[PDB]
Amino acid sequence: SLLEFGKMILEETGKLAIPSYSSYGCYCGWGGKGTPKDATDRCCFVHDCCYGNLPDCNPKSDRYKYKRVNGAIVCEKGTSCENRICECDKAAAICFRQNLNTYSKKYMLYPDFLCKGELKC
Ligand SMILES: CN1c2ccccc2[C@]23C[C@H]4[C@H]([C@@H]5CC(O)N4[C@@H](C5)[C@H]12)[C@H]3O
Ligand SMILES: COc1ccc(C(=O)O)cc1
């Protein structure tokens, strides 16, 4: 659920999901079209796609459990949907951390009309 995800992001990067990653570029947030503006936005695109492989799961509200094993995120056993949601979120958090160096405030509150082009998962 968004609760586990925003907490995962905060622990990883130091930034809060909202508003550092809720209205970023073309894919971080409500976003769902265009060409990712940068690496961080590409993390959200892939995260999007990852949730995309789980049509019968509800990523926003289904809660999962996870623990830190010396920094490393370890998804704990839950239902099938919860395990996969967690893997999707774990990947995005790490991707976010790996690209913190290029995070640009230029792509914050990014206009919808500048999300141009197309990309398939
Ligand atoms: C295509 N679409 C879907 C088609 C059928 C069921 C569920 C989904 C989505 C909505 C949502 C989310 C991610 C992130 C995203 O932008 N959306 C994608 C993948 C999915 C995922 O949940
Ligand atoms: C990062 O926080 C959120 C909250 C709600 C939604 C949504 O409702 O689609 C997406 C991200």
UniProtKB/Swiss-Prot annotation:
Cofactor binding annotation: Binds 1 Ca(2+) ion.
Membrane-spanning residues: none
Reactions catalysed: a 1,2-diacyl-sn-glycero-3-phosphocholine + H2O = a 1-acyl-sn-glycero-3-phosphocholine + a fatty acid + H(+)
Catalytic residue list: 47, 89
PROSITE patterns xref list: PA2_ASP (PS00119), PA2_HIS (PS00118)
GO biological process: arachidonate secretion; lipid catabolic process; negative regulation of T cell proliferation; phospholipid metabolic process
Binding site for Ca(2+): 27, 29, 31, 48
Example of a GO cellular component annotation carried by this entry: extracellular region
Highest taxon listed in the record's lineage: Eukaryota
Tissues in which the protein is found: Expressed by the venom gland.
Location relative to the cell: Secreted
Keywords on record: Blood coagulation cascade inhibiting toxin, Calcium, Disulfide bond, Hemostasis impairing toxin, Hydrolase, Lipid degradation, Lipid metabolism, Metal-binding, Myotoxin, Neurotoxin, Presynaptic neurotoxin, Secreted, Toxin
Role summary: Snake venom phospholipase A2 (PLA2) that shows weak neurotoxicity and medium anticoagulant effects by binding to factor Xa (F10) and inhibiting the prothrombinase activity (IC(50) is 130 nM). It also damages vital organs such as lung, liver and kidney, displays edema-inducing activities when injected into the foot pads of mice and induces necrosis of muscle cells when injected into the thigh muscle. Has a low enzymatic activity. PLA2 catalyzes the calcium-dependent hydrolysis of the 2-acyl groups in 3-sn-phosphoglycerides.
Record text on subunit structure and interactions: Monomer.
Extra remark: D.russelli pulchella is synonymous with D.russelii.
The protein's name: Basic phospholipase A2 VRV-PL-VIIIa
Organism: Daboia russelii (Russel's viper)
